[model samples]
Target: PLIVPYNLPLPGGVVPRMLITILGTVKPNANRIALDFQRGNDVAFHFNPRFNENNRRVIVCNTKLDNNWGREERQSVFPFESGKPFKIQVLVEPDHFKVAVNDAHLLQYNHRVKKLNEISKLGISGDIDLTSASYTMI
Candidate 1:
C-alpha cells in the first residue's frame, strides 16, 4: 500500500527524478513519511488492517517540509519496505514535490522553503513490501 500524501498543483515545466521506490504484499509501517506540494498539499489514507497482520500502527501522511532546506539534517533519505508489491514514484524540484503511483494516485510535497528554489529530491523510508517507483515533475 503506497499511502503517502502529496496532491497539489504546480505552474508548469516542473521536472524531477525519483531515486527510490519499494514494493510489498503487506502493511509496511516503519518510519517517517514525506511528500512535496506546490501551494497546499492534501493528504488522506485508509486503514487496511487486512494488510496489517503484524498490526504496526504507523503514520500514513502527506507532509510539507521546509525552513530547513539544504540542511544536512534534512537531506538524509532512507528508503525502506512494507513487504508488499507497491508501484510508486518520487519527484523533488525547486518549487514542488510531485508523486504519482499506479493509476489516479497522486501526492505533492513542497520544498525550497523560501519560495526561490525548486525541490529536487524524493526520499522514502519504511517497512513494507516494495515493487517499483518512478519520479517526475510536470
Candidate 2:
C-alpha cells in the first residue's frame, strides 16, 4: 500500500562525502520502505529496504529516469525489524553512496547519474514512521 511520501530538499544538491541521516521506526508488519534521492524526474539513488518480500529480507538499490528502471542491485544484509527504531546514514561519494544501518556498514551503489549535484530531493515512503531526517553537505 502507498503511504504519504516525505521529502527534504537538499540545498545546492549533493557533493562528495555528503551525509544524509534518516531516523524512523518500522511499522508493525511492514513490508518495505523506499528512500529516493530525486533530481527533477530522475532519481539519482533509490534505496529500498524490504523487511519481508516473498518471505525474504533484501535491500534493492537502483536509479530511475523517464519512468525507466535500472537493474536492481540487491544485498542480503538485513538489519531492520518490524516495530523497531532505525538509524540510516547515507554517505555520498563522487562515484557511489555508502549506506550504513544502525551504525553498521550496509551496502553501496555506484552513481547512475554521474553528476552528483543533480540530486536535489530526498523522499521516503512505505511502512515507516519517520521521526527525523537530515541532510548535510560537506
Candidate 3:
C-alpha cells in the first residue's frame, strides 16, 4: 500500500496532453485532502477537497506563487465520500487542467504558472490512503 503525504518526481515534468491519475480511499473521519503540482517553492496547482468545512462540502482550487495564494476557485460538486475509494484524473492541457473524479468530468482550472515543464514535483496528502499515483502522456 502507498503511504499518505506522498511525493514523487515527474520524469519530464508536466506537459500538455498528459494525464495524471490518483487512486485512493478517503478516511472514514476525513476532513480534507490535497493534491499539488509544484515548481520549486511555488505551487502551479492546488486541488483541495474539503468534507466538513462549516458543515458543507467544497472543492477548492488555487495557485501559490511567491508564498502567496491566489484567488480560490470553489465548486460544490462533491464526488468524494468518507470511507470510500475514489479516482482522480487530471489532464494537463495547453492552457488549463481538466480534472475528473470517478471518471466523471469535474472542473477545470486555468493555468496560473505558465512554465509547465518546471513543475517537476507531485504531492498528495491529508486524510486518505493512497493506492497509486501516476502520469502518462495522452
Candidate 4:
C-alpha cells in the first residue's frame, strides 16, 4: 500500500519493553501495510504486511539498519483480508518483537538494534485505514 507517512510520539517514548496494539482495515486493493518504530531517523523495528506480489500468501518482516535493509523474515499465515478489519498486537521484548493477529500468535522478529527503548515514535503507512493505535508498558 505504501499509504502515507504519519508520525505520532509515544505517550512518553517507549520503555525498556512494552506491548503495542493497532486496529486497522486493509484497503480492498491493499498492496501493503507497515508500522515503523522510530528514533529520529533510525528505525528500531519495521513491521510490514504485504498483500500482493511476493505476498501472494505471506507476510514479510524486516528492519533497516544504517539505511540498509536486513534479511526478510516471511510468515505463511495471512490473517488479513482486503476491506476487512484486523487487530494486531506486538510484544516488544529485550531482543525481539512478537506479533499476533486477531488473538493468535503470528511471528517473532529478533532485533537488529539491541536497545528496545530506542523506539520513541510510531509511524504507519501502506494501504490501511487505521481505527486505533495504542501501547502499554509491561
Candidate 5:
C-alpha cells in the first residue's frame, strides 16, 4: 500500500527483520486496529507498563481480515495518538530493532528473533494513521 504521506515498503535483508509501514487514523475510542496476514507464530511489541494512552501500541492478529477472530489488541509502543500529523517507520532486524519518525528519533523494539525474514504474516493496530502498508520479500 503506497501511503499518501509518502512511505517506502522495500525488501530488507542482511539482518532479520520485517518492515511495516502504516498511515491512518484511530477513530474516537477505537483501539488500534491492525490489518494482518497470519501464517505462523506472530510476535508482539510489548512494554513493561501498557501504553494505556487510549491509542498506544495496538495490534489485531490471530486471524485474517475477515470477521473471524474479531480481536483488536493494543501495543505499548505508542505508534500513534489522536488527531495529528505524524509519520513513522518500524524496522525489525535479526536482534536489533528501530523505529524512526520522519527520520528523527530511533526507538528500539526490544530483542529480536532469528529468521524474521520468514515472518510471512503482518499486522497493524495502533493509534496511528496507516495511509499505506506493504511487505516485500528479501
Candidate 6:
C-alpha cells in the first residue's frame, strides 16, 4: 500500500532520548522526499532527500520560523536509492537530532528551535511508500 503526505502526532511530543523510526521504499522515479518535525505552524526540522538536484543526490536540512526558511545544510553522501526500501532513525538529544539511514550514521542537525517537545507533529511527503513510523523513548 502506498500512502504519502502523511502526518502523525507525537503523543507526548518530542523529548530527549527518543528515537523516531521510519521505514519506506522510494519510488522508482522519485525526485524528492521530506520528513519534517513541526511545531504548530512552524517547522522545527526539515529533513529532505533529493535525487534530482543537478543530477546528484543530496540531503538538505533546515528549519523554518515565522514563514521563513533558514540556511540549508546539505550533505553529499547518498544513502538511498530509487525502488529500494530504507530505514531511517532520528535520535532526539538535548541539543541535536542524530539521523541514521539503513543502519549507518548519516548526519546531525543542531537544534534551531529549542523547545523540542513543542514539535508535536511528524510530517512525511513526496515520492515514497511509507510502511511504519514510530517513536520510542530510550
- RMSD of each candidate? 11.1, 2.5, 0.7, 2.8, 7.4, 0.9
Per-candidate TM equals 0.35, 0.93, 0.98, 0.86, 0.49, 0.97
Q: Which candidate model has the greater lDDT, 5 or 6?
A: 6
Which regions of candidate 2 deviate over 4 angstroms?
1-4
TM-score, cand. 1:
0.35
In order, what lDDT does every prediction score? Answer: 0.36, 0.88, 0.94, 0.78, 0.43, 0.92
lDDT of 3 by residue, 19-123 (tens): 999999999999999999999899999999999989999999999999999999999999999999999999999999999999999999999999898999989
Candidate 1 per-residue lDDT over residues 26-132, each given as its tens digit: 34443333333332221211111122324443323333443222322121121224444445544554455444454323554454344322323333333443333
Candidate 6 lDDT score relative to the true structure:
0.92
Q: How many angstroms is residue 105 displaced in model 1 relative to the true structure, after the best TM-score fit?
A: 3.3
Write one digit per residue (lDDT tens) for candidate 2, span 1-138: 223488888977899878899998899989989999998889889999888778899999999989899899999888999999999999998778999999999988998887677788989888888888897766
With a 3 Å backbone cut-off (N, CA, C), the pairs that clash in candidate 2 are none
With candidate 4 superimposed using the best TM-score fit, by how many Å does residue 15's alpha carbon deviate from the native?
3.4
Q: Which run of 10 residues does model 6 get worst, by summed lDDT?
A: 1-10
Measured with C-alpha atoms, the lDDT of residue 65 in candidate 2 is 84
In candidate 3, which residue pairs get closer than 3 Å at backbone N, Cα or C atoms, i.e. clash? none
Estimate the lDDT of model 4: 0.78
* Candidate 1 residue-wise lDDT at 126: 38
Candidate with more favorable, higher lDDT: 1 or 4: 4
lDDT agreement of model 3 with the native: 0.94
Query: What's the count of clashing pairs in each model shown?
Result: 44, 0, 0, 4, 17, 0
Model 6 residue 19 lDDT score: 95
Number of the top TM-score candidate: 3
TM-score of 2: 0.93
- Give model 6's TM-score versus the native structure: 0.97
